[PDB]
Write a protein that holds these residues in place. Structure first.
Motif, PDB file in Angstrom:
ATOM      1  N   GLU A  62      12.830  10.612   4.909  1.00  0.00           N
ATOM      2  CA  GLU A  62      13.173  10.106   6.214  1.00  0.00           C
ATOM      3  C   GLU A  62      14.466   9.444   6.854  1.00  0.00           C
ATOM      4  N   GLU A  63      13.863   9.569   8.763  1.00  0.00           N
ATOM      5  CA  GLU A  63      15.662   8.522   8.972  1.00  0.00           C
ATOM      6  C   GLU A  63      15.413   7.118   8.564  1.00  0.00           C
ATOM      7  N   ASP A  64      13.801   7.227   8.820  1.00  0.00           N
ATOM      8  CA  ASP A  64      13.261   5.202   8.670  1.00  0.00           C
ATOM      9  C   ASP A  64      14.045   4.669   7.046  1.00  0.00           C
ATOM     10  N   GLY A  65      14.294   5.858   5.839  1.00  0.00           N
ATOM     11  CA  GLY A  65      14.553   5.215   4.664  1.00  0.00           C
ATOM     12  C   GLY A  65      13.533   5.812   4.164  1.00  0.00           C
ATOM     13  N   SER A  66      11.723   5.954   4.752  1.00  0.00           N
ATOM     14  CA  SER A  66      10.575   6.214   3.462  1.00  0.00           C
ATOM     15  C   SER A  66      10.917   7.284   3.371  1.00  0.00           C
ATOM     16  N   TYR A  67      10.583   7.944   2.219  1.00  0.00           N
ATOM     17  CA  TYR A  67      10.442   9.790   1.793  1.00  0.00           C
ATOM     18  C   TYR A  67       8.720   9.712   1.887  1.00  0.00           C
ATOM     19  N   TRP A  68       9.139  11.288   2.081  1.00  0.00           N
ATOM     20  CA  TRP A  68       7.748  12.406   2.129  1.00  0.00           C
ATOM     21  C   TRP A  68       7.663  12.310   0.509  1.00  0.00           C
ATOM     22  N   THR A  69       5.943  12.345   0.388  1.00  0.00           N
ATOM     23  CA  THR A  69       5.719  12.665  -0.764  1.00  0.00           C
ATOM     24  C   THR A  69       6.208  14.252  -1.431  1.00  0.00           C
ATOM     25  N   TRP A 119       3.703  18.118   2.343  1.00  0.00           N
ATOM     26  CA  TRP A 119       2.088  17.770   1.686  1.00  0.00           C
ATOM     27  C   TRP A 119       2.127  16.895   0.274  1.00  0.00           C
ATOM     28  N   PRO A 120       1.503  16.199   0.867  1.00  0.00           N
ATOM     29  CA  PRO A 120       0.565  15.337   1.768  1.00  0.00           C
ATOM     30  C   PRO A 120       1.155  15.231   2.758  1.00  0.00           C
ATOM     31  N   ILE A 121       0.777  14.646   3.828  1.00  0.00           N
ATOM     32  CA  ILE A 121       1.475  14.842   5.064  1.00  0.00           C
ATOM     33  C   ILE A 121       1.067  13.229   5.442  1.00  0.00           C
ATOM     34  N   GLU A 122       2.151  12.733   4.715  1.00  0.00           N
ATOM     35  CA  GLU A 122       2.190  11.357   4.017  1.00  0.00           C
ATOM     36  C   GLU A 122       3.880  11.104   3.500  1.00  0.00           C
ATOM     37  N   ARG A 123       4.182   9.825   4.193  1.00  0.00           N
ATOM     38  CA  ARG A 123       5.313   9.791   3.393  1.00  0.00           C
ATOM     39  C   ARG A 123       4.890   8.059   2.422  1.00  0.00           C
ATOM     40  N   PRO A 127       0.975  -1.465  -0.123  1.00  0.00           N
ATOM     41  CA  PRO A 127      -0.191   0.061   0.329  1.00  0.00           C
ATOM     42  C   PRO A 127       0.432   1.192  -0.041  1.00  0.00           C
ATOM     43  N   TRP A 128       0.282   2.558   0.498  1.00  0.00           N
ATOM     44  CA  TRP A 128       1.233   3.145   0.111  1.00  0.00           C
ATOM     45  C   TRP A 128       1.560   3.902   1.275  1.00  0.00           C
ATOM     46  N   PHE A 129       0.916   3.169   2.239  1.00  0.00           N
ATOM     47  CA  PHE A 129       1.593   3.391   4.022  1.00  0.00           C
ATOM     48  C   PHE A 129       0.757   2.404   4.445  1.00  0.00           C
ATOM     49  N   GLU A 130       1.397   2.001   5.827  1.00  0.00           N
ATOM     50  CA  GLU A 130      -0.065   1.278   6.742  1.00  0.00           C
ATOM     51  C   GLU A 130      -0.675   1.928   6.987  1.00  0.00           C
TER      52      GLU A 130
END
Ligand SMILES: [Mg+2]
Ligand code: NI
Length: 346
Positions: free
Chosen positions: A286-293, A303-307, A34-37
């Motif tokens: 981000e610190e965990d390797g995920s990326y803000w959109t 924005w959006p407030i989502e990784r 998915p997009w994220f959990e």
């Protein structure tokens, strides 16, 4: 590692693997990426995520994702536009979304050489591409969506450009399988002609950066025409030091669109600007390797407030293309992809 992409000074192989691990950590028990959990799943970003997992060598979650494609494919060959934790939220079919499985499957075969995987996924790809070609309109463009009440007979340039590349990947798989698909060859030739010569067939969406670079990314436009197209809107979209705008009228840069442009620039050999744009979007990391959109660059707000998993996935594919690490790195460059029947247009 040394098999994982890295770009010295920009992205270490450890960082590439970490981003892929954050994608894998979001996988649902069904195999959906998915997009994220807690967020939704769409088939296109699901496959994009699976491709990035493959690039990073996380083959187990990648195979679970392709299994999800196989086991959730609907009788007509399609997948729903939107699912959330297994609950379908939009049951229509998006032609671009359904075609992309072909790209993901061929990419996986290029990297792994796994003929058993190819044999398992071949009927999935074939049913999906047959479904997509059944959405083709008389002029060669593809309807963007199908619902139970019929086709939505508008065509989107970005989706058609993606489908063009996806069908060529399907033809590469058809060759690998030894099963010629003359109908696909005709369809992809007519689609490429529409993209290149019939701008009136598509909804006008001039403000979106994806409409600008996707004809190049997907291979419908290369050479001098592609260089000219990239240069035509460069300053409308590219924000110095930050990546590129999603839309030309908002001060908002997005990681996925930046990294897709990187793939398009790499495809036309513009490695100088491909590297510059790739380097410019890692403020989203981000610190965990995920990326803000994305980033609203005139006030500092994400924005959006989502990784989003698929922003990191796009980054990984761009890193592979720039570094030429895995055997799949050049799938968008497309050197060896079949072209279909270039002629006899109707
Ligand atoms: Mg489903
Ligand atoms: Ni024509």
């Amino acid at each position: 590692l040394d098999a994982v992409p890295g770009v010295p000074g920009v992205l270490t192989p450890e960082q590439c693997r970490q981003t892929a691990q954050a994608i894998a950590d979001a996988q649902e028990p069904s195999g959906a990426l998915p997009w994220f959990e807690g967020g939704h799943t769409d088939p296109w970003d699901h496959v994009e995520n699976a491709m990035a997992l493959t690039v990073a060598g996380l083959l187990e979650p990648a195979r679970a994702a392709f299994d999800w494609c196989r086991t959730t494919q609907r009788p007509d060959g399609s997948w729903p536009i939107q699912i959330r934790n297994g609950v379908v939220e939009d049951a229509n079919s998006d032609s671009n979304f359904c075609a992309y499985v072909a790209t993901g499957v061929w990419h996986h075969v290029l990297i792994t050489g796994d003929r058993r995987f190819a044999e398992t996924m071949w009927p999935v790809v074939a049913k999906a591409i047959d479904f997509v070609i059944d959405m083709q309109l008389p002029g060669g463009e593809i309807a963007w969506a199908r619902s139970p009440s019929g086709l939505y007979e508008e065509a989107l340039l970005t989706g058609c450009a993606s489908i063009y590349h996806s069908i060529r990947c399907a033809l590469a798989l058809a060759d690998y399988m030894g099963e010629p698909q003359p109908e696909w060859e005709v369809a992809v030739g007519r689609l490429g002609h529409a993209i290149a010569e019939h701008p009136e067939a598509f909804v006008t969406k001039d403000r979106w950066s994806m409409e600008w670079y996707y004809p190049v990314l997907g291979g419908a436009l290369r050479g001098e025409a592609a260089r000219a197209r990239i240069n035509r809107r460069w300053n409308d979209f590219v924000v110095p030091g930050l990546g590129i705008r999603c839309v030309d009228d908002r001060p908002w840069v997005t990681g996925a669109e930046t990294c897709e442009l990187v793939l398009a620039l790499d495809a036309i050999g513009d490695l100088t600007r491909a590297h510059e744009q790739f380097a410019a979007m890692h403020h989203l990391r981000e610190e965990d390797g995920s990326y803000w959109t994305g980033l609203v660059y005139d006030d500092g707000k994400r924005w959006p407030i989502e990784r989003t998993t698929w922003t990191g996935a796009a980054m990984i594919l761009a890193a592979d293309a720039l570094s030429r690490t895995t055997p799949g790195n050049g799938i968008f460059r497309g050197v060896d992809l079949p072209r279909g029947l270039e002629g006899e247009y109707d």
